[PDB]
């Protein structure tokens, strides 16, 4: 029954997202025919779509005995795509927050810096950065067979004679950084400063152009913190003896919780306020001298 709730919520996530992602991407390049904002929304939609492209395999995996009848090689590719798309989505939400900060507070230098070539080069840089983060974490992947439970054991203990057991913390810790230090801190500080900044400038007009900042950050944190706290819990498990098979069952939920905001992004950032499918000329007259 514990896996049942995770399976049903994961299935609801697919239904909320796959139609949603398709609806978004089908009009990212059609809304005004282009803009940097729609470009980043398009690329984030790509990140979510390929994030959910391998999701059926994962949801099939987690539900039934955590067994992996997809060979041994597909663990590497599935983990690579999942992690890369997850980081891409997180980083794109961060850069959207930065764009909001730039375009809302002192929107004077944005006009001469909001060039299309700058958007393309930053997109390429962020894509290669996500790829180079995914590389070492996905390349080091394998599978252990313990009674039909062929889990994708990457290298958690004694990969090679060249490697040691020193990775077990660091590979998570910098991971914990990319999931906590960069997104959470920056989003929180930018959102708060934009929130009380507009108060003194009176630009905040309520309804449209507002009321969205609050929801996007709380959902993000409540979805993304459990994964990192579970990683820290595993790091704690590494020492001070093993704390029994208890817990570790909400992870399919927590990642499923993560799945939730993957279907939340297409529904709220772009489906709000503006929607399309959902002055005589100056003349002249005579005058007596």
């Amino acid at each position: 029954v514990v896996h049942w709730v995770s399976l049903v919520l994961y299935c609801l996530a697919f239904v909320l997202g796959i139609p949603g992602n398709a609806i978004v991407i089908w009009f990212t390049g059609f809304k005004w025919k282009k803009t940097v904002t729609t470009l980043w929304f398009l690329n984030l939609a790509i990140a979510d779509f390929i994030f959910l492209l391998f999701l059926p395999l994962y949801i099939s995996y987690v539900a039934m005995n955590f067994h992996w009848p997809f060979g041994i090689w597909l663990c590497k590719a599935n983990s690579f795509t999942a992690q890369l798309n997850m980081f891409a989505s997180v980083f794109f939400l961060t850069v959207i927050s930065l764009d909001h900060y730039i375009h809302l507070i002192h929107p004077v230098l944005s006009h001469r810096h909001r060039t299309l070539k700058n958007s393309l080069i930053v997109i390429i840089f962020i894509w290669l950065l996500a790829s180079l983060i995914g590389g070492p974490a996905l390349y080091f992947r394998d599978t252990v067979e313990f009674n039909n439970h062929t889990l994708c054991y990457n290298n958690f203990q004694k990969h090679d004679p060249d490697l040691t057991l020193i990775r077990h913390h660091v590979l998570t810790w910098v991971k914990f950084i990319i999931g906590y230090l960069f997104p959470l801190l920056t989003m929180s500080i930018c959102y708060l400063c934009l929130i009380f900044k507009v108060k003194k400038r009176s630009i905040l007009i309520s309804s449209r152009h507002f009321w969205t900042i609050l929801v996007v950050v709380v959902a993000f944190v409540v979805c993304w913190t459990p994964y990192h706290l579970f990683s820290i819990w595993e790091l704690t498990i590494h020492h001070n003896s093993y704390s029994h098979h208890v817990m570790q069952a909400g992870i399919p939920l927590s990642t499923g919780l993560a799945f939730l905001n993957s279907c939340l992004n297409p529904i709220l950032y772009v489906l709000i306020s503006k929607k399309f499918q959902a002055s005589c000329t100056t003349a002249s007259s005579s005058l007596a001298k």
Binding site: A82, Q83, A137, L151, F156, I237, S241, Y242, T255
Partner: peptide
């Protein structure tokens, strides 16, 4: 001890 894999979630 038990040597748990610690990959119940995607890397």
């Amino acid at each position: 001890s038990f040597y748990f894999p610690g990959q119940f979630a995607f890397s």
